[PDB]
């Protein structure tokens, strides 16, 4: 699994 977020909430 990657270590970053694109869509937050």
């Amino acid at each position, epitope marked *: 699994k990657g270590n*970053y*977020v694109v*869509t*937050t909430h």
Partner: antibody, heavy 122, light 108 residues
Framework: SEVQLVESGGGLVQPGGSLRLSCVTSGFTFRKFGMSWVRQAPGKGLEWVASISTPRGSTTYYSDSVKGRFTISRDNSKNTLYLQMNSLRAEDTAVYYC?????????????WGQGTLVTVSS | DIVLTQSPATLSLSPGERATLSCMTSTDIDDDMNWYQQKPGQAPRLLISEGNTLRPGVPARFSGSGSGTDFTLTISSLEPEDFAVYYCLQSFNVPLTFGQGTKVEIKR
């Protein structure tokens, strides 16, 4: 291309100086996409600079080369991405491209602007 | 940081021939590999995204294969417009990192 990314704010700057790049977008719902800056030094390859989350842009990522010196931000009401560039060095000289992350879960770029040239020199 | 190693740095071929471009990664990146084309003076163009997904509008002669650590871009039969530089990009982790490029040039 229906999607357009238009960079501005580039130019000459002295080492130690600052510039703020802007990218105004059209052709998509800006607030729904992650965005990045990628640069290309003269005669060299591509190098990722920074990325920002969607929608608010709370969450940001930087290359070690620029961490602490550059800040990525967005203003969704203006469809605009920014790169504040401080403490500039000669090796920051490059064409800077605004880019759109192609999916809701990846910063891999689909669309690119034409780029803006930043030249850092005394 | 994940290192992408593209080879050969120069691929010398004629129109009509099959082009095979390789990108190897320093660690397993699952299928998060992307391929770009760039011509002189122009911005890059995305050809293939994560999962070897051909982008809409990109000609069928382009295809990506491989996963894990060893990735290939194939151009089944080169058209004159395909002589250009190609970059690979991993989007598994930050920092997002690119290969150093492969130039597909005209053999004579």
């Amino acid at each position: 291309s229906e999607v357009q990314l238009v960079e501005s704010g580039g130019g000459l700057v002295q080492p130690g100086g600052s510039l703020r790049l802007s990218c105004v977008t059209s052709g998509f719902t800006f607030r729904k996409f992650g965005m990045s800056w990628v640069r290309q030094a003269p005669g060299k390859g591509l190098e990722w600079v920074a990325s920002i989350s969607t929608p608010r842009g709370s969450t940001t990522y930087y290359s070690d080369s620029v961490k602490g010196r550059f800040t990525i931000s967005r203003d969704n009401s203006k469809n605009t991405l920014y790169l504040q560039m401080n403490s500039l060095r000669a090796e920051d000289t490059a064409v800077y491209y605004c880019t759109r992350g192609y999916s809701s879960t990846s910063y891999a770029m689909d669309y690119w602007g034409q780029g803006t040239l930043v030249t850092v020199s005394s | 940081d994940i290192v992408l190693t593209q080879s050969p740095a120069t691929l010398s071929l004629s129109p009509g021939e099959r082009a095979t471009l390789s990108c190897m990664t320093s660690t397993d990146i699952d299928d998060d590999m992307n391929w770009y084309q760039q011509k002189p003076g122009q911005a890059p163009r995305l050809l293939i995204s994560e999962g070897n997904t051909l982008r809409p509008g990109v000609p069928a002669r382009f295809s990506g294969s491989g996963s894990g650590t060893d990735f290939t871009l194939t151009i089944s039969s080169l058209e004159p417009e395909d002589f250009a530089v190609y970059y690979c990009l991993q989007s598994f982790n930050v920092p997002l990192t690119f290969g150093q490029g492969t130039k597909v040039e005209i053999k004579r």
